[PDB]
Amino acid sequence: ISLENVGCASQIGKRKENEDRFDFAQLTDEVLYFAVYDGHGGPAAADFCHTHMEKCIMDLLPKEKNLETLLTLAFLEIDKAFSSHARLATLLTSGTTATVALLRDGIELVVASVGDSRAILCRKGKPMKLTIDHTPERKDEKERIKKCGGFVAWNSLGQPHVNGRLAMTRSIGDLDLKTSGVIAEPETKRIKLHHADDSFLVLTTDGINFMVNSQEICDFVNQCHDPNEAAHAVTEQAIQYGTEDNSTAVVVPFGAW
Ligand SMILES: [Mg+2]
């Protein structure tokens, strides 16, 4: 897996600020990192994650061999550190998704997420979704919101929001909703890559996600010669469909690219 062929694109769109962050790096000889963070309420929370995630992960790697466990601890560590940082005034309502992929030894893929940023494995030409959206229509998420003293309010567009404010049920930051069910504990997915079958991994933010489903995302990517082109093609398509949000994509090529 060569990081020199990863594609990335981040387009601000019709917003005053780009609140998306993305990154990838080689953390150790065995472990590669890829992440998108889709901010809301100001970029503070996404930028924080973008600034602190590598080190938080690298510190944990000699202590935790289980990548799913590691990523869970890391997300909670990062949220704890962010909350100290905001405390010490819009920062109290700054929040972010976080979708983090670790790839160990070129073959063991672990994805941890809170929120609605997607990670899609293209396996044998078909989308395999490696995240599930943390949104208020989800039965388990609904139930935990009520259990912790939050509630769901539906806006005039028929969209559900936690306490009438937040469209997702897990995030980093959103400190005012951390005691009402909006947790930083991620869900994780583990998959063994198969380099004959597996074509790429694509991470996307809501500027894309609101415009296209995950099959359409794979479609855009597959019509492109390289990941770099693919990553721009995905973001530009979202914009052409009239998206108003920041649009960010990371395309990581695998054996079957
Ligand atoms: Mg956003």
UniProtKB/Swiss-Prot annotation:
- The EC number of this protein is 3.1.3.16, 3.1.3.52
Q: What is its main location?
A: mitochondrion
- Report the co-factor binding details: Binds 2 Mn(2+) ions per subunit.
Residues with Phosphoserine modification: 156
Q: Which residues form the PPM-type phosphatase domain?
A: 5-254
Q: Where in the cell is it found?
A: Mitochondrion matrix
Binding-site residues for Mn(2+) 2, renumbered to this chain = 38, 206, 245
- Keyword RNA-binding assigned: no
MF terms from GO for this chain are:
[3-methyl-2-oxobutanoate dehydrogenase (lipoamide)]-phosphatase activity; manganese ion binding; protein serine/threonine phosphatase activity
Metabolic or biological pathway, per its Swiss-Prot or TrEMBL entry: Protein modification
Provide the activity regulation entry from the record: Up-regulated upon interaction with the 24-meric DBT/E2 core of the BCKDH complex. Inhibited by Mg(2+) and Ca(2+) ions likely by competing with Mn(2+) ions for binding to the same metal-binding sites.
Keywords (alphabetical) are: Hydrolase, Manganese, Metal-binding, Mitochondrion, Phosphoprotein, Protein phosphatase, Transit peptide
Report how activity changes across the pH range.
Answer: Optimum pH is 7.5.
GO biological process terms, semicolon-separated:
branched-chain amino acid catabolic process; regulation of intracellular signal transduction; regulation of mitochondrial membrane permeability involved in apoptotic process
What does the function comment of this entry state?
Serine/threonine-protein phosphatase component of macronutrients metabolism. Forms a functional kinase and phosphatase pair with BCKDK, serving as a metabolic regulatory node that coordinates branched-chain amino acids (BCAAs) with glucose and lipid metabolism via two distinct phosphoprotein targets: mitochondrial BCKDHA subunit of the branched-chain alpha-ketoacid dehydrogenase (BCKDH) complex and cytosolic ACLY, a lipogenic enzyme of Krebs cycle.
Describe its partners and assembly state.
Monomer. Interacts with E1 and E2 components of the branched-chain alpha-ketoacid dehydrogenase (BCKDH) complex; this interaction requires colocalization in mitochondria. Interacts with BCKDHA but not with BCKDHB of the E1 component. Interacts with the 24-meric E2 core composed of DBT monomers with a 24:1 stoichiometry; the N-terminal region (residues 49-61) of PPM1K and C-terminal linker of the lipoyl domain of DBT (residues 145-160) are critical for this interaction, whereas the lipoyl prosthetic group is dispensable.
The record's family statement is: Belongs to the PP2C family.
* Protein's name according to its UniProt entry: Protein phosphatase Mn(2+)-dependent 1K
